[PDB]
Design a binder for this molecule. Structure first.
Ligand SMILES: Nc1ncnc2c1ncn2[C@H]1C[C@H](O)[C@@H](COP(=O)(O)OP(=O)(O)OP(=O)(O)O)O1
Ligand SMILES: [Cl-]
Ligand SMILES: [Cl-]
Ligand SMILES: [Cl-]
Ligand SMILES: [Cl-]
Ligand SMILES: [Mg+2]
Ligand code: NA
Ligand code: NA
Ligand code: NA
Length: 326
DNA sequence: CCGACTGCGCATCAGC
DNA sequence: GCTGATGCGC
DNA sequence: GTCGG
């Protein structure tokens, strides 16, 4: 990428602010600046040039000037050698360990992978699974494996009930050559915004996927959202595939377009689009787009017949999924 | 200057 | 138990 | 940390 050095710097700063400073708005500000620089189609020559972009302000412009002239950022070089910041940043790489738990563990002298492994009884269930698969969860998934995973999920769902529709979203739907995890949107005509005519709709699908040894572990599970672990079957004498994160979201069938818009992302794209909606007087979530009243109270959901309808309401030209990787 | 910053499911905890 | 807040990840 | 009004 043309400006990878700068965007890596801003990403490292974002992670510092989230994990160590617990400053969520700075985390989001740094990620917004990284995203807008990442799509800028020129190699940046100065901080002033970058400051023309929305989300890049005075302080980031100065950091860009430092980075361009020296290849480094003193602020980050100091963070990298600070033990407490390093410890906290490492611990948050375990799924289920966030900024608060990371700092609490450091306080208690739980600081390394070996520390975590000998203190499993101090981890909740999610953290325990995150530790178990620490290495695997940092490996990306090639699209070819995503296709095999898609084939299993769609066929197993069909066997439970042919009226289910499962749609793989996230980075896969945006056409990525590799994905961090698998995201599956699920619908069934029994579950709408008007009624739930059948219970256990998500449970049934999870169970079937566990029964064929595709889903291997559960991080969290409720009526509409499953988060867990899966693994492709391997062949005779072949090394096993890494374990992979899988999320499944059951969305009311009449709200598919809002749900598929949400679950396709990217996360920053959704943030930017939802922010634009607010400036247009709407609010978007994974279920509906609603107008905001004069008082800032969401009104009734607007009719939605396609993903493009949502774009039309907020006066955005339609963007195909592959153009949403912000 | 300064209020506002996208939006939410599930796990966990506090207070009653 | 319920309710509401916080953590976490999405 | 950035920005709109
Ligand atoms: N913070 C968020 N706000 C709004 N939507 C989000 C947020 N995080 C995630 N999403 C939505 C958009 C994402 O594309 C989708 C799936 O999440 P996620 O799996 O983390 O990202 P991803 O599929 O885009 O990339 P990856 O390849 O890393 O898995 O959920
Ligand atoms: Cl902040
Ligand atoms: Cl650096
Ligand atoms: Cl919809
Ligand atoms: Cl809603
Ligand atoms: Mg994903
Ligand atoms: Na700017
Ligand atoms: Na984590
Ligand atoms: Na995901």
């Amino acid at each position: 990428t043309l400006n990878g050095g700068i965007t890596d710097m801003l990403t490292e700063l974002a992670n510092f602010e989230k994990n160590v400073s617990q400053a969520i708005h700075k985390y989001n500000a740094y990620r917004k600046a990284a995203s807008v620089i990442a799509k800028y189609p020129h190699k940046i020559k100065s901080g002033a040039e970058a400051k023309k972009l929305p989300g890049v302000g005075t302080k980031i412009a100065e950091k860009i000037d430092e980075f361009l002239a020296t290849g480094k950022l003193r602020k980050l070089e100091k963070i990298r050698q600070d033990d407490t910041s390093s410890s906290i940043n490492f611990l948050t790489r375990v799924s289920g360990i966030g900024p608060s738990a990371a700092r609490k563990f450091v306080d208690e002298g739980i600081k390394t992978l070996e520390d975590l492994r000998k203190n499993e009884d101090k981890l909740n269930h999610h953290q325990r699974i995150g530790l178990k698969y620490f290495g695997d969860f940092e490996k990306r998934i090639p699209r070819e494996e995503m296709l095999q995973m898609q084939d299993i999920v769609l066929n197993e769902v069909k066997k439970v009930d042919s009226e289910y529709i499962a749609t793989v979203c996230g980075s896969f739907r945006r056409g990525a050559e590799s994905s961090g995890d698998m995201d599956v949107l699920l619908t069934h005509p029994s579950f709408t915004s008007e009624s739930t005519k059948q219970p256990k709709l998500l449970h049934q699908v999870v169970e079937q996927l566990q029964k064929v040894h595709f889903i291997t572990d559960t991080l969290s599970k409720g009526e509409t959202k499953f988060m867990g672990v899966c693994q492709l079957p391997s062949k005779n004498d072949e090394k096993e595939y890494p374990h992979r994160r899988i999320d499944i979201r059951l969305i009311p069938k009449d709200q598919y377009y809002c749900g598929v818009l949400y679950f396709t992302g990217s996360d920053i794209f959704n943030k930017n689009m939802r922010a634009h909606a607010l400036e247009k007087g709407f609010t978007i979530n994974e279920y509906t787009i609603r107008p905001l009243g004069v008082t800032g109270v969401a009104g009734e959901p607007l009719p939605v017949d396609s993903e493009k309808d949502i774009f039309d309401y907020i006066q955005w030209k339609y963007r195909e999924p592959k153009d949403r990787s912000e």
